[PDB]
């Protein structure tokens, strides 16, 4: 329930990583989503390569498996002057040992001591047993690979549901009973809208008939619903008496009455140019 | 000293083990099979060589090494030593010296 201005982020030229998957970073302001999740952290530099789908590594496997079908953007920037301290900043903890890799977006905060060997540890570190989390020497004199980097991941969720976050764009007027290019809540298409007597339950937004195309749709500004009919189409069939006999012609438009298109209306369509 | 990437007289002057090994090192004590009461000196070890060895390189040269500046010409003497020294394998020795 808040507008996302991705231009401020994308055009900032301060973030050291702009990795968008499934969505182009320049169209983040043009599409919109039902929800977006933000995860903000500080990670080393040789390791920001591990924050992306389908990768391996201690953070990629033992910290956060990102699924191969990600739709989101990975954003990171330097924090040498904001995170590091002279004496070493050890407030961020990381595990090197786990029993198995974490699930997609799985969070484990368990402080159990891992058994590297045969007999149990019983909550004490030690001989084939280590406390899971180790500290990092974030220092302002460290090399780039070991410097701290602040990472934010933005997973945009795109389902067939109301969109609560939408980018910077201008909503226009509504016109009815005419062939338009329409965009309702991110649903783009072309057709003619008509008032509909259907009733929508308070959770119900869209409507379908037999196929993926949405028959009806709801209005965001006003609590109203209008159905959608495709703009008129038909085959133009041409009648002729033979150019040998004459150059006159007649045209037939299949399956329409003669409103949208010497006029003869037939059950096959409107006939134009031929007398009755 | 028998593992990839290590140093030592056996590691350097006897058999350099490359850092990219795919294999297993297996050993066991032979106090009751290799040692004799009077000392088993049938196993010889070099302590001096001109240079460290290549991986899996085998040298059986018996040339006397030149510790000084004068040449030895295959004869020991001042700053001239034979390559191989014998080992005092005895059943009363310590494990550091046990075979």
């Amino acid at each position, epitope marked *: 329930n808040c507008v996302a201005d991705y231009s401020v982020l994308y055009n900032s030229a301060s973030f050291s990583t702009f990795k968008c998957y499934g969505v182009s970073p320049t169209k983040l302001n043009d599409l919109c989503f039902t929800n977006v999740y933000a995860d903000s952290f500080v990670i080393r530099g040789d390791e920001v390569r591990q924050i992306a789908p389908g990768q391996t590594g201690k953070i990629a496997d033992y910290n956060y498996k990102l699924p191969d079908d990600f739709t989101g953007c990975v954003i990171a920037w330097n924090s040498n002057n904001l995170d590091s301290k002279v004496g070493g900043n050890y407030n961020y903890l990381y595990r090197l040992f786990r029993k198995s890799n974490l699930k997609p977006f799985e969070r484990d905060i368990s402080t159990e001591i891992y*058994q*590297a*060997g*045969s*007999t*149990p*540890c019983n909550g*004490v*570190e*030690g*001989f*084939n*047993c*280590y*406390f899971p989390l180790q500290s990092y020497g974030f220092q302002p004199t460290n090399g780039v690979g070991y410097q701290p980097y602040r990472v934010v991941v933005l997973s945009f969720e795109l389902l067939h549901a109301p969109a609560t976050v939408c980018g910077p764009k201008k909503s226009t007027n509504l016109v009815k009973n005419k062939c338009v290019n329409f965009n309702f809540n991110g649903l783009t298409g072309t057709g003619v809208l008509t008032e509909s007597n259907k009733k929508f339950l308070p959770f119900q937004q869209f409507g379908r008939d037999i196929a993926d195309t949405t028959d009806a749709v709801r209005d965001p500004q006003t609590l109203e619903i209008l159905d959608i009919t495709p703009c008129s189409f038909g085959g133009v069939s041409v009648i002729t008496p033979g150019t040998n006999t004459s150059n006159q012609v007649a045209v037939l438009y299949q399956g329409v009455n003669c409103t949208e298109v010497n006029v003869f209306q037939t059950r096959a369509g409107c006939l134009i140019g031929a007398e009755h | 000293q028998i593992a990839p990437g290590q140093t030592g007289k056996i590691a350097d002057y006897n058999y350099k083990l490359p850092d990219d090994f795919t294999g297993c090192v297996i*050993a*066991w*004590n032979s106090n009751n099979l290799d040692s004799k009461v009077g000392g088993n000196y049938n196993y010889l070890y070099r302590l001096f060589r001109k240079s460290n060895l290549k991986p899996f390189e085998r040298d059986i040269s018996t040339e006397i090494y030149q510790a000084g500046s004068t040449p030895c010409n295959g004869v020991e003497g001042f700053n001239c030593y034979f390559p191989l020294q014998s080992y005092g394998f005895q059943p*009363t020795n*310590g*494990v*550091g010296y046990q075979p």
Partner: nanobody
Amino acid sequence: QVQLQESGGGLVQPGGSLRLSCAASGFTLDYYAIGWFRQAPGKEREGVSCISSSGGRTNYADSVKGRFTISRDNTKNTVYLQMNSLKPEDTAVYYCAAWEASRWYCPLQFSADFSSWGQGTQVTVSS
């Protein structure tokens, strides 16, 4: 840089108690089984007490059963050996050694090499 260091040696009265500790540096003592070994004057070096790597299995010499207790502090990378009811027969230079199991079977009863050795500490029982 792997080092094994014994500590706690000294001079005690027979019937008294003493505690030894073996600490490791440059490597985690944590993956290896540790056994404590002594060499009496004029005798060979014998295995007094051994304990498995992660500590679920132990072995004691029959001369010392019911008198010494081997325990190994897990978090601190140290192995201890508690001696009670010490006797003049226990006067020896005491070594701590670390190695991996030469065998299947959880027990550490048998003997083989000991990859790392300390310099040892002196335990003297005399009165």
